[PDB]
């Protein structure tokens, strides 16, 4: 049990690092997604804005 | 230790599941960030390419 525990605890803590690494990567991907969404938004809106202003001429 | 193991195993399993949930969420973020970039810069950057033509004349 000490060995199985060391493995369960080691695997748990390691896997917990995989949890925090995947989680961190998810947050970073979300910050990137957001930034991407923000740029998308900003561009579509900048164009739609400018286009509305410039629909005429 | 049996309980510490079951608990560590719960933690290991938790972490395997949490990792699984995050394996899913990392892939969802990998696919959502991908899809958002793939559709967002591809569309809005395309919209700016279209600006090159839209604003011609």
């Amino acid at each position: 049990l000490s060995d199985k525990l060391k493995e369960a605890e080691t695997r748990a803590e390691f896997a917990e690092r995989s949890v925090t690494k995947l989680e961190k990567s998810i947050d970073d991907l979300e910050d990137e997604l957001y930034a991407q969404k923000l740029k998308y938004k900003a561009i579509s809106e900048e164009l739609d804005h400018a286009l509305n202003d410039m629909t005429s001429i | 230790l049996s309980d510490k193991l079951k608990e560590a195993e719960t933690r290991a399993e938790f972490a395997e599941r949490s990792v699984t949930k995050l394996e899913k969420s990392i892939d969802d973020l990998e696919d959502e960030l991908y899809a958002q970039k793939l559709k967002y810069k591809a569309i809005s950057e395309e919209l700016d390419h279209a600006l090159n033509d839209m604003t011609s004349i």
Partner: protein, 375 residues
């Protein structure tokens, strides 16, 4: 035995009591809310034997005791028995006299007035506490989690209160009080374990089933698929060891129990479940509040420790919620101990010293004062 006149924190529920000293990060005295009494005729003499046993005494000698809980569905129904729990918790385990330690007690926002005033009265007239305060569990949960905003799902043994707070302010019109709690989940398990050939009705049996639930049960993210395999194969069964060396093997009952949280009809309750109530606590708040409550769905108290529950809830609220919106659950490992932690944070807060009712104001106004002074 403490080195400072710090208020005690005592989260006394229908299940267990978590007690300790304000300013610390954990309770020091944890007891079940149990007062036990012998149900047998004595034969030997000079055996000691108490009229009543409390806390751990009640469980250690339980083989011949009937065990009762002084607190039911969020309130004290037997205050004399709570004085017995409190005396032991304070003087034997925490080793403190309330006379120099004001003590913070907890309650749900829509909890009957009688309970908040009775708790105040006992501490002032039986324990001679110099001051009192009764706190909202949702407040304490948000302090412990590092938030001023969120939905507190305090899903313990007594009542699930489903209460929203925004920028530190209560949003009481949106509190969804729900008559579904950990005590009902235990009763449901006793009934479906009866279906398997293992009836549980007596005190020893009731305590065993609660222990089975805490150790074996889970919700996971998909009930029907989990049931399809649990009902078809031994591969999803888990054995539990009973106190006499015998065992019970449990299959889909393992998840059918806590599923009552998502399917209250399992115990005859007219409810759509805890995710509907979480959703309504968010939805019934103003439109510029909703976004912050969706992002701060807070798990607190008991049952928050069922495997898959933090994610199960985020999924179930997301399913009811508008698209685009981010629904997020706050579910730290300090789950269920967060009310105690908040009690410590609030009781010791310099900005909250004036919130204590002193034993001056108490006698001039009587115990009903707690209703006007605490919040």
């Amino acid at each position: 035995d403490e080195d400072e006149t710090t208020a005690l924190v005592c989260d006394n529920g229908s299940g267990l009591v978590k007690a300790g000293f304000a300013g610390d990060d954990a309770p020091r005295a944890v007891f079940p809310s149990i007062v036990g009494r012998p149900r047998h005729q004595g034969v030997m003499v000079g055996m000691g034997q108490k009229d009543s046993y409390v806390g751990d005494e009640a469980q250690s000698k339980r083989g011949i005791l009937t065990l009762k809980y002084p607190i039911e569905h969020g309130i004290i129904t037997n205050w004399d028995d709570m004085e017995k729990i409190w005396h032991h918790t304070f003087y034997n385990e925490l080793r403190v006299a309330p006379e120099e330690h004001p003590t913070l007690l907890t309650e749900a926002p829509l909890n009957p007035k009688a309970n908040r005033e009775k708790m105040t009265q006992i501490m002032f007239e039986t324990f001679n506490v110099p001051a009192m305060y009764v706190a909202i569990q949702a407040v304490l949960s948000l302090y412990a989690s590092g938030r001023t905003t969120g939905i507190v799902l305090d899903s313990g043994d007594g009542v699930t209160h489903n209460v929203p707070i925004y920028e530190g302010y209560a949003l009481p019109h949106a509190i969804m009080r729900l008559d579904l709690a950990g005590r009902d989940l235990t009763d449901y398990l006793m009934k479906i374990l009866t279906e398997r050939g293992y009836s549980f009705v007596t005190t020893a049996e009731r305590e065993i089933v609660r222990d089975i639930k805490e150790k074996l049960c889970y919700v996971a993210l998909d009930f029907e698929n989990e049931m399809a395999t649990a009902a078809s194969s031994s591969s999803l069964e888990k054995s539990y060891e009973l106190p006499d060396g015998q065992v019970i093997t449990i299959g889909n009952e393992r998840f059918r129990c806590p599923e009552t949280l998502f399917q209250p009809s399992f115990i005859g309750m007219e409810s759509a479940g805890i995710h509907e109530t979480t959703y309504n606590s968010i939805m019934k708040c103003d439109i510029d509040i909703r976004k912050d409550l969706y992002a701060n769905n807070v798990m607190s108290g008991g049952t928050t420790m069922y495997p898959g529950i933090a994610d199960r809830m985020q999924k179930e609220i997301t399913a009811l919620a508008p698209s685009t919106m981010k629904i997020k659950i706050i579910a730290p490992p300090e789950r269920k101990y967060s009310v105690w932690i908040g009690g410590s944070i609030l009781a010791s807060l310099s900005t909250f010293q004036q919130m204590w009712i002193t034993k001056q104001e108490y006698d001039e106004a009587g115990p009903s004062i707690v209703h006007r002074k605490c919040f």
